[PDB]
């Protein structure tokens, strides 16, 4: 006899990012 | 008499995940 | 003898992506 | 006397996934 | 003797793509 | 006392796929 | 009678989570 | 009889981040 | 007065595997 | 005053996806 | 008087995801 | 003033791995 | 007189993400 | 007047690991 | 009359998140 | 006039760790 309200929310954000560059450079006179 | 020798390696990788939840309740009479 | 009313929702995205590009060069003389 | 060698890869990958449910329960009499 | 009603959806999408374009050219003289 | 090599080559596809369920039920007197 | 090597490799990653949930429960005659 | 309300949020955010980088360069003569 | 059960769930399973190879060789005499 | 030169590749791909929903409900008094 | 020019690569990619949801409602007096 | 029971259960597994090797070889007489 | 030059890279990723959630709701008098 | 019960869990795993790992080796004669 | 260089680089990580909440709400007189 | 109860816990744990191991060799002779 009675009036009751839930209201519950989640959120969740990831973000995740790498960069690798490696270079070589040799030379011989 | 020379030689040279060029390499150039550039890897990248990105991720992103998002998660979202909504729940209501509601009781009356 | 209750009215009751019950809403739940849910919603999820992903997006992963990758990109690699390598290249070489050699030079003889 | 001389020689050139010269070569190139690039590759990407993309995927993206998403997801919804929707639930809702009504009761009364 | 009591009145209930229920209603629900899930939608679903996924888009896999790739793309790989790799070339390579030697000159010798 | 010379000579040339070309090679290329190059792929991409696509994949998509999309689906979409439906329940709902209502029950009274 | 020379020989010189030059080479360079730089990686760099960044992570960041963010994570956020609300509550409300209300209850009342 | 009565009425009664209850509010709780929870929020947290992680960031993290580094970057290497190193290289090397040697000269014979 | 009545006793109504409801029971629904929903399984999706997905597998993408890909393989690539290439190679290639050069004599010159 | 001669050479020869071979390049091979080769590539697979296998995309696999299985669902499987349930849905079952009961009503008695 | 020669030169050979070998060159080899190789990737592989694997992704699988599974989703299982369950719910159940019974209502009585 | 009735009996309601509601249980609902969601789980969700992602796993996704990938592997690339690349070689390289060239010799000069 | 002679020259060989062998390179090797080898890249590997896994990655792993598990949710759950558990809601139950009861009600009676 | 009447008697309710709400349990509500969630839980979330995410393992994300990557290893990169390259070498050079030339030899000049 | 000879020169080799051989170089290595290893790089790993690991990140291991783990979220858990409980909600427990009972109201009856 | 009655009686209400309300339990909330929140627990996370987040590991992350990172290992980068380089090295470099070179002989002249």
Do not use: E, I, P
Not at 13 to 27: G, H, I, K, P
């Amino acid at each position: 006899h009675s009036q009751g309200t839930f209201t519950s929310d989640y959120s969740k954000y990831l973000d995740s990012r790498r960069a690798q560059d490696f270079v070589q450079w040799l030379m011989n006179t």
